[PDB]
UniProtKB/Swiss-Prot annotation:
Family: Belongs to the calycin superfamily. Fatty-acid binding protein (FABP) family.
Subcellular location: Cytoplasm; Nucleus
PANTHER family: FATTY ACID BINDING PROTEIN
Positions that bind a fatty acid: R128, V129, Y130
Protein name: Fatty acid-binding protein, adipocyte
Phosphotyrosine, modified sites: Y21
Signal sequence coordinates: none
PROSITE patterns given in the database record: FABP (PS00214)
Gene name for this UniProt entry: FABP4
Residue ranges of the motif Nuclear localization signal: 23-33
């Protein structure tokens, strides 16, 4: 029951500072502009200890499956090859991605009926707000 309140199908409804977050990460112009239009569906499910998170949109369909605390390989929507570790900290899913000596953290939090996603790269934060689909 570790992630019960995250499980479901969620749809992006608002974004703030996302272009600047992508810039900070190193995403190129064309990907930023196209990817910035997308309104992804985030689909979270749990089976035993395995959590699966899918992101489906016009831009890209991605899927990760993982066990909390156990590092895995991930190819991100913007084609970075990263080493990812996802943990639960005080009820927040904390996803750290490492590549090329860089690091970014993505936090997923339940707030009221929303799932609020905070993406941080150095001093730049972006907030992506999802509602139930
Ligand atoms: O898209 C999101 O809301 C954020 C928070 C959850 C994971 N996530 C990303 O990895 N976003 C993204 C993060 C980066 Cl640096 C670049 C892109 Cl292209 C996306 C992206 C954009 C549109 C659709 C899919 C991915």
């Amino acid at each position: 029951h570790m992630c019960d309140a995250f499980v479901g199908t969620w749809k992006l409804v608002s974004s703030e500072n996302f272009d600047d977050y992508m810039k900070e990460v190193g995403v190129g112009f064309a990907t930023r502009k196209v990817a910035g239009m997308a309104k992804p569906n985030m689909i979270i499910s749990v089976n035993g200890d395995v959590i699966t998170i899918k992101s489906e949109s016009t831009f890209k369909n991605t899927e990760i499956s993982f066990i909390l605390g156990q590092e895995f390989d991930e190819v991100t929507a913007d084609d970075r090859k990263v080493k990812s570790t996802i943990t639960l900290d005080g009820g927040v899913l904390v996803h750290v991605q490492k590549w090329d000596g860089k690091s970014t953290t993505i936090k997923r939090k339940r707030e009221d009926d929303k799932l609020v996603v905070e993406c941080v790269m150095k001093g730049v934060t972006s907030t992506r707000v999802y509602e139930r689909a």
